[PDB]
């Protein structure tokens, strides 16, 4: 659930999920269209696509459990939806951390009309 993804973000990047990742580029927070504007935005695009392969689950509200062996994210066994939601989130966080060095403030609150074109998952 969003509860988890967001604390996972915070633990990983050091930034708060809502301001920093809730409205970035074209795909972070409201995804529907356009070309992702960067790494971080692409992370969100792969993330939205990951949720996409789970039409019968509920990403934002279904809670899963996870632990850290050392720095590593390890998803604990739950329902099949929960394990798979957890795997999509783990990816996004790592993806966010691997591209922190190019995170740009100019893509915060990015206007909708500047997101043009479909891109296939």
């Amino acid at each position: 659930s969003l509860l988890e993804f967001g604390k996972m973000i915070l633990e990983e990047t050091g930034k708060l999920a809502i301001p920093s990742y809730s409205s970035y580029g074209c795909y972070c927070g409201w995804g529907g269209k356009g070309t992702p504007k960067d790494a971080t935005d692409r992370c969100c695009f792969v993330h939205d696509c990951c949720y996409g392969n789970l039409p019968d689950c509920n990403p934002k509200s279904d809670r899963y459990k996870y632990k850290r062996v050392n720095g590593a994210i390890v998803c604990e066994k739950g329902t099949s939806c929960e394990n798979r939601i957890c795997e999509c989130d783990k990816a996004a966080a790592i993806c966010f951390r691997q591209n922190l060095n190019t995170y740009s403030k100019k893509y915060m609150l990015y206007p909708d009309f500047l997101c043009k074109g479909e891109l296939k998952c």
Binding site: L2, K7, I9, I18, Y21, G29
Partner: peptide, 4 residues
């Protein structure tokens, strides 16, 4: 704590 995030998005959508």
């Amino acid at each position: 704590v995030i998005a959508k």
